[PDB]
Amino acid sequence: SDRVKKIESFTLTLPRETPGEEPNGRGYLVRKANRTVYPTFDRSVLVRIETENGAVGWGETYGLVAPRATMEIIDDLLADFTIGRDPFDAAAIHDDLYDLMRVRGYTGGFYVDALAAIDIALWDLAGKLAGLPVCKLLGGQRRDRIAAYISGLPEDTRAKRAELAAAWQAKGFSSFKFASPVADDGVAKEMEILRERLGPAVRIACDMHWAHTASEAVALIKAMEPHGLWFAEAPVRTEDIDGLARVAASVSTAIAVGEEWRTVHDMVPRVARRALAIVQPEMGHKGITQFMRIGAYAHVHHIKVIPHATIGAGIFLAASLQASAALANVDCHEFQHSIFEPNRRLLVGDMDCLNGEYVVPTGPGLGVEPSKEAQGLLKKH
Amino acid sequence: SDRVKKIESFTLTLPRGEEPNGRGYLVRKANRTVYPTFDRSVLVRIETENGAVGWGETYGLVAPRATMEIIDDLLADFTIGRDPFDAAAIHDDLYDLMRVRGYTGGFYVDALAAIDIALWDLAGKLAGLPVCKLLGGQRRDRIAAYISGLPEDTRAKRAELAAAWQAKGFSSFKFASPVADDGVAKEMEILRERLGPAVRIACDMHWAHTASEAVALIKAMEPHGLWFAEAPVRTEDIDGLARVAASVSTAIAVGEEWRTVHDMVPRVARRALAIVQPEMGHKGITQFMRIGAYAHVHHIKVIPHATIGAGIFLAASLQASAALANVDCHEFQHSIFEPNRRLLVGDMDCLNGEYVVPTGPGLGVEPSKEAQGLLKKH
Amino acid sequence: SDRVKKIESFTLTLPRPGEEPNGRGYLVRKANRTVYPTFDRSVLVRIETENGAVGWGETYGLVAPRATMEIIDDLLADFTIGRDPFDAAAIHDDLYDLMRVRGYTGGFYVDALAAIDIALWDLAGKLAGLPVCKLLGGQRRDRIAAYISGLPEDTRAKRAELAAAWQAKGFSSFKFASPVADDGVAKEMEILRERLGPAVRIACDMHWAHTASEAVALIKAMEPHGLWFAEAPVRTEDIDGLARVAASVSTAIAVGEEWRTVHDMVPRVARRALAIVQPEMGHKGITQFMRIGAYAHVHHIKVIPHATIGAGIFLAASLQASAALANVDCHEFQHSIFEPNRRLLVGDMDCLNGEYVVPTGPGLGVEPSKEAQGLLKKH
Amino acid sequence: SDRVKKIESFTLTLPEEPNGRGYLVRKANRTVYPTFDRSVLVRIETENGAVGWGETYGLVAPRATMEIIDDLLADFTIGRDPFDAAAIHDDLYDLMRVRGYTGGFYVDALAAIDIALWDLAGKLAGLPVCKLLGGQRRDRIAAYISGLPEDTRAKRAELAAAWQAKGFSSFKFASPVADDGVAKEMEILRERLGPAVRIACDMHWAHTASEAVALIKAMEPHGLWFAEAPVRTEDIDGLARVAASVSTAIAVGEEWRTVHDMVPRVARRALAIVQPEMGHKGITQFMRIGAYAHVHHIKVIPHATIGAGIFLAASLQASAALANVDCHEFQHSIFEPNRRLLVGDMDCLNGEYVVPTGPGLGVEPSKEAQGLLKKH
Numbered sequence A: 001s002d003r004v005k006k007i008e009s010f011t012l013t014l015p016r017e018t019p020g021e022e023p024n025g026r027g028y029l030v031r032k033a034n035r036t037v038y039p040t041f042d043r044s045v046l047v048r049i050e051t052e053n054g055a056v057g058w059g060e061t062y063g064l065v066a067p068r069a070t071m072e073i074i075d076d077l078l079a080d081f082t083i084g085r086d087p088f089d090a091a092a093i094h095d096d097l098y099d100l101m102r103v104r105g106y107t108g109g110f111y112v113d114a115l116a117a118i119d120i121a122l123w124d125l126a127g128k129l130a131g132l133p134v135c136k137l138l139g140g141q142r143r144d145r146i147a148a149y150i151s152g153l154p155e156d157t158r159a160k161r162a163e164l165a166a167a168w169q170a171k172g173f174s175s176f177k178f179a180s181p182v183a184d185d186g187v188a189k190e191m192e193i194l195r196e197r198l199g200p201a202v203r204i205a206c207d208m209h210w211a212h213t214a215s216e217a218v219a220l221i222k223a224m225e226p227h228g229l230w231f232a233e234a235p236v237r238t239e240d241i242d243g244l245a246r247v248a249a250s251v252s253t254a255i256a257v258g259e260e261w262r263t264v265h266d267m268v269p270r271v272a273r274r275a276l277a278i279v280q281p282e283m284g285h286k287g288i289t290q291f292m293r294i295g296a297y298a299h300v301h302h303i304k305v306i307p308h309a310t311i312g313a314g315i316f317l318a319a320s321l322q323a324s325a326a327l328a329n330v331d332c333h334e335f336q337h338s339i340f341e342p343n344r345r346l347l348v349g350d351m352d353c354l355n356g357e358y359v360v361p362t363g364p365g366l367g368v369e370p371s372k373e374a375q376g377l378l379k380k381h
Numbered sequence B: 001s002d003r004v005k006k007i008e009s010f011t012l013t014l015p016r017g018e019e020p021n022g023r024g025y026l027v028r029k030a031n032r033t034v035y036p037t038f039d040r041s042v043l044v045r046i047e048t049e050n051g052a053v054g055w056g057e058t059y060g061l062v063a064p065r066a067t068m069e070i071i072d073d074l075l076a077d078f079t080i081g082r083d084p085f086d087a088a089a090i091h092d093d094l095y096d097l098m099r100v101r102g103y104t105g106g107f108y109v110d111a112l113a114a115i116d117i118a119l120w121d122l123a124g125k126l127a128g129l130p131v132c133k134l135l136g137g138q139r140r141d142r143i144a145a146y147i148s149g150l151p152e153d154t155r156a157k158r159a160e161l162a163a164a165w166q167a168k169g170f171s172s173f174k175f176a177s178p179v180a181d182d183g184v185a186k187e188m189e190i191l192r193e194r195l196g197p198a199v200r201i202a203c204d205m206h207w208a209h210t211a212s213e214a215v216a217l218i219k220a221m222e223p224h225g226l227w228f229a230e231a232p233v234r235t236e237d238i239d240g241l242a243r244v245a246a247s248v249s250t251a252i253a254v255g256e257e258w259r260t261v262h263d264m265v266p267r268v269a270r271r272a273l274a275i276v277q278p279e280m281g282h283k284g285i286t287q288f289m290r291i292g293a294y295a296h297v298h299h300i301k302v303i304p305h306a307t308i309g310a311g312i313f314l315a316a317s318l319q320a321s322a323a324l325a326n327v328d329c330h331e332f333q334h335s336i337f338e339p340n341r342r343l344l345v346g347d348m349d350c351l352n353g354e355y356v357v358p359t360g361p362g363l364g365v366e367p368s369k370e371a372q373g374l375l376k377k378h
Numbered sequence C: 001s002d003r004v005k006k007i008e009s010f011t012l013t014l015p016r017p018g019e020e021p022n023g024r025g026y027l028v029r030k031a032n033r034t035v036y037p038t039f040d041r042s043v044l045v046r047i048e049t050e051n052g053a054v055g056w057g058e059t060y061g062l063v064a065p066r067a068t069m070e071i072i073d074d075l076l077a078d079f080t081i082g083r084d085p086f087d088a089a090a091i092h093d094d095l096y097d098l099m100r101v102r103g104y105t106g107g108f109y110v111d112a113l114a115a116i117d118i119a120l121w122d123l124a125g126k127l128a129g130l131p132v133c134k135l136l137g138g139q140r141r142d143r144i145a146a147y148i149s150g151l152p153e154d155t156r157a158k159r160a161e162l163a164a165a166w167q168a169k170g171f172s173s174f175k176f177a178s179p180v181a182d183d184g185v186a187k188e189m190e191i192l193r194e195r196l197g198p199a200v201r202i203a204c205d206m207h208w209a210h211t212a213s214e215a216v217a218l219i220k221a222m223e224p225h226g227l228w229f230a231e232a233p234v235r236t237e238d239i240d241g242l243a244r245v246a247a248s249v250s251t252a253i254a255v256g257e258e259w260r261t262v263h264d265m266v267p268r269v270a271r272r273a274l275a276i277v278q279p280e281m282g283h284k285g286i287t288q289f290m291r292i293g294a295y296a297h298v299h300h301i302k303v304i305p306h307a308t309i310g311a312g313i314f315l316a317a318s319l320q321a322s323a324a325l326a327n328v329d330c331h332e333f334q335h336s337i338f339e340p341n342r343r344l345l346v347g348d349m350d351c352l353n354g355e356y357v358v359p360t361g362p363g364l365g366v367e368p369s370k371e372a373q374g375l376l377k378k379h
Numbered sequence D: 001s002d003r004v005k006k007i008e009s010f011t012l013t014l015p016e017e018p019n020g021r022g023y024l025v026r027k028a029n030r031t032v033y034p035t036f037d038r039s040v041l042v043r044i045e046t047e048n049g050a051v052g053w054g055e056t057y058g059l060v061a062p063r064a065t066m067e068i069i070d071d072l073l074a075d076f077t078i079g080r081d082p083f084d085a086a087a088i089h090d091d092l093y094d095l096m097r098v099r100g101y102t103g104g105f106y107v108d109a110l111a112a113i114d115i116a117l118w119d120l121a122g123k124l125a126g127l128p129v130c131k132l133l134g135g136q137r138r139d140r141i142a143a144y145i146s147g148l149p150e151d152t153r154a155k156r157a158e159l160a161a162a163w164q165a166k167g168f169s170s171f172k173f174a175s176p177v178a179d180d181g182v183a184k185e186m187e188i189l190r191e192r193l194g195p196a197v198r199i200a201c202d203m204h205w206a207h208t209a210s211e212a213v214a215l216i217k218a219m220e221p222h223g224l225w226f227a228e229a230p231v232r233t234e235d236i237d238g239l240a241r242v243a244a245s246v247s248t249a250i251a252v253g254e255e256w257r258t259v260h261d262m263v264p265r266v267a268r269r270a271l272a273i274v275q276p277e278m279g280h281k282g283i284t285q286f287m288r289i290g291a292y293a294h295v296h297h298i299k300v301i302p303h304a305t306i307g308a309g310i311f312l313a314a315s316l317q318a319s320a321a322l323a324n325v326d327c328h329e330f331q332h333s334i335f336e337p338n339r340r341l342l343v344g345d346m347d348c349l350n351g352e353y354v355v356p357t358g359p360g361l362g363v364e365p366s367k368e369a370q371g372l373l374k375k376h
């Protein structure tokens, strides 16, 4: 039976772009507002895995910052220990790979990014080898469409953002999220405009972008609640578990977190403190094995799953849809309009998002692969 | 895309102030539990449109027609037409049928289990893969086995039945605390100085103790090296079990009588076990794996129960256990497993203190023709 | 010295998107993924002593009733025959023990104990010439306040009209199901509270399918209209969720209809997760019902029994047990079940002017009519 | 149906200097003791002439108890149906609860009335009390030897020996009586009686948690059955700490009055065994405590004390109906002399109580007894 023969990693850089916030000599800028670094152009790391019989699997992970660090991990360590393995042992292979370095504490960050790209490609292969979509190897397909929500409203002013939203509503979308930092007029007002414009039927959530104390977050949420708030995301710092638990206990709005996590181990202490109502796994950080472990833990603990979505060619997005098709508790899924649209030329397969819903790809494996054009754009490590 | 077409249920009977009654049931004065005089289980045969067949099995010791009725009157119709690659999702749908009325354990889940195992059996045949390869990977093809019990009337006779099993490769054992007529310290003391400081020896305490009673028995065993202590208190006595777990340095093991991962949650939350012992015949592959995944997340070891059966749910257990990270050992019913080799075709085996995980597609085992002829339809 | 002689089990059937029943009469409501028969059906048990005294029990028979009758006929019956009905609670414990170590501690198994248990108490009452409640510590009341269990109409307004009609007949306590509140629970509470006035009590049955935070939000939206209790806010196994809801809302949380034994209650109470317990006699039997009522008493929890489809036998047992409990406030009443089934019983169990009349005679004070017995289908 | 017609109450007397009233204080435990044993009895008669008997403590100021019965409770009981016995208990408890009369003499007084009404109930139905409590589970009840009233360790060991030879295999000694330390006491008794018997210790309250834990750790090597009353009744924190700090079972309850007393202790996991005293509690409370124990997998080992035998009879009936009854205390010193005061088959021999067989309590005061009653 077929075994992994070779593994290659590449970056894929895209022409889509991100006062005193100019990129540095390496193409990185920092937003003074949040002290977070951003690259100038979209970019992700892809991994190509081929078996002895010539089957090919594709995986993908973040590559926004120092992507050659991730590729070095794949190339220097993981590749040589994955060659020879059976892709049907994907989750066990994942655990083996994770154990290589766990006792030295490389149990997140770049290390799990690397693991994810490999994990996704092995699962892609398993599906192809068996002639099944990945969700049929994950316990079954529960749905073939997944509701999508508009990830944000990147406009200059409140008025404009609200119109942008109404445009999307016209296309069949009835769930939306805005980021609190962009709310120049304040969250209460943003919420007011959106509710007014869009009506009482739509769901409206707010991503608070982490930088608040528990008390600051509570005040902001309370100010939004009168206008019908779907959920509040990332109200406090990642490390501030006590803060997160206080916030969830203090407001009646569902609290959502998780996009910056890496493994199910990250979820456990937040559930222990009943600090979240919704988990938001980002497939590109986690890989299928962990993303499923988080979704299953959410099932046991009665937490809703609303996966994150981000900059990427569509490979880990495809994995996110497959895994999401197989999870009991997946309600809805983030949708990045300005990323999904332009990236269409990069993919072959029938993945789509239209009329407020994702279409889960149907072919074996992920159901999608990089187009000939995409494969030409790839730059090998 | 192949689909479930028909489902049939059967019983299969195997011969082994407490006389059996009209219907062959007796009650041990010792533990107030009911027993059949004849061992019996419930099998399920599932066939798809294209003619693939899957087999499942659950308990049938008592009122097995009740379980077959659940299967035949309710579950069958909601399974027929489904894709067996959706086994887990099908499990959740069937469980939801009756959950709001509180049918979330006992006979209802026994019924779900037999169907679940059959469906997974089909998924593997259709993919031409062992079930463990549909459960995230095969992590082992052998699973260490421990000797379930030593049924003899004397502390000395028991110490022998054991030594013999030891002479056959086995190096882990368990004894039942009620069987120890001389006291459990005697039992431990003897077994230890008769099998060496090598083997692992555990005690199944059979539920009937208060926390403080159980702590006393355990401390009297601990000097002799106690591998684990199973079922030290009543199933309902979660506080009791938490107190026991915290008061002794011995691993506490529970789980054979549960049905779903939901049963495990409250016990993990009280740090009330170090080992979970799922019984596949009660749970099915879907629940078994969920319990094993939960154990993995919570750093709990997995030592699956084994029991009276044809070998169908046992084969399921072995497949699930090959795919679990935290499976250390697996119980071995020597008295049962032994004479049932004539009921199965496939390469499932146990020797030299280890189970061999069956290799074929699906569970890797099926009832022989001779076994199917013994089946009594519902 | 009269002992149990024989035991028989029967069913009793009664008329009433892609949800068409299948060839076995079962449909699944897409909304809640739950199965329903297209026909009321319960399981009855008839127990007779050496001396010819007869007692009746009843329990759920909505789905696979044969399974429950099989547990009674194959297992439980032989171990009851020969025993003294005045040992009903002792007997229940013995039968529970037969299978407890294998985990048959709820579901169909306890349904089976319940029918047997109720018939035995019926007998002990008949044999003593006393109402069941005079064997349960004493009668404390002979009338039990009743509340309207549901409002089966398809608009908010038609549902308010329905409640007002019941108000006209002397009812002053009501409950609606959140899944039917097409306008939302807030709007539902508003029209009910406006149509019926400031004095009526209005509860919401939330029907399990919510996360704790979804539940808290729904409840907060209802509270400004004076919410009596919120029932089944989250999944049964979601005890963490249940505790968090109770701790986050000022409204009384009610649970219990789907439990089986007092053991089910302990962990919820230990988490302070309920203000009201709602035992269902048809699932529990009198022994378990009363142990739950007494646990409630010690823990200052109100008891508001559930009511459901049935012949009226387990209902009667519910009224007897209720008449003996300190903490019984009111009792659920389903007209739709109750009125039709009047033909099926001899005795004085009634419900009018917002109150259950507790049956007078010995035992349960009721028994199936000739007509009913003529409809029984033996297992 | 028959109804309560009248109620009367009486004392019955039986046989560090006592004061002019019969009371002495033991420097040891600061507790007061009468010189003559004494209890309070109540006699209840129906319209139709049925008669029930009940009893409670009368050791100290028995007139206070009888006064509560006579002045308050009697008039609110006359007219009620005895089959409502438990409902009547709650009604009576409620007369005074808001003023905080929820234990002590008040509940003593309720207990005597409760016991009499249950008697009437059984009699009226022609049933032993246990058949009105949900069934009889047993007719014999393992008994254990309450104490070893000897001035020397060697002598006590022997007295236990005599008892072992008459069929008893469970024993308890009081830690204060142990002149050479509780460790030496356990050791000798364990050697004299072998490794089979159960030996418990009643520590008589007067210890801090840490004192108690040290004493118990000293005893444990010698096979300790349970430790009773290790700290003050009000010291629930201390009780919890004791239970959590030793592996031995902790036993309490003899001085409680109601099931509400038990809840706070169970909540702190502070006990493995409850020791209800029928004389303080009555059948209603006794049974409620017994059921609460059942739910929480706690053992029930009822206490026994100086008495006529009426509340002892109630205790056996109740215990015959309890699921969790392990054994029952045995006061040989009281029980044997007192036999002449009772009519019925209540017995204790070969290490077992025989539960009375007749209807109601199955026992009633002898003609000699009734002659000796002093009315209130």
Ligand SMILES: [Cl-]
Binding pocket: A108, A109, A110, A111
């Ligand atoms: Cl890193």
Ligand SMILES: [Cl-]
Binding pocket: B105, B106, B107, B108, C104, C105, C106, C107, C108, C109, C110
């Ligand atoms: Cl069941």
Ligand SMILES: [Cl-]
Binding pocket: D103, D104, D105, D106
């Ligand atoms: Cl007082």
Ligand SMILES: [Mg+2]
Binding pocket: A207, A233, A234, A259
């Ligand atoms: Mg975010």
Ligand SMILES: [Mg+2]
Binding pocket: B204, B230, B231, B256
């Ligand atoms: Mg076991």
Ligand SMILES: [Mg+2]
Binding pocket: C205, C231, C232, C257
């Ligand atoms: Mg309800």
Ligand SMILES: [Mg+2]
Binding pocket: D202, D228, D229, D254
């Ligand atoms: Mg004492």
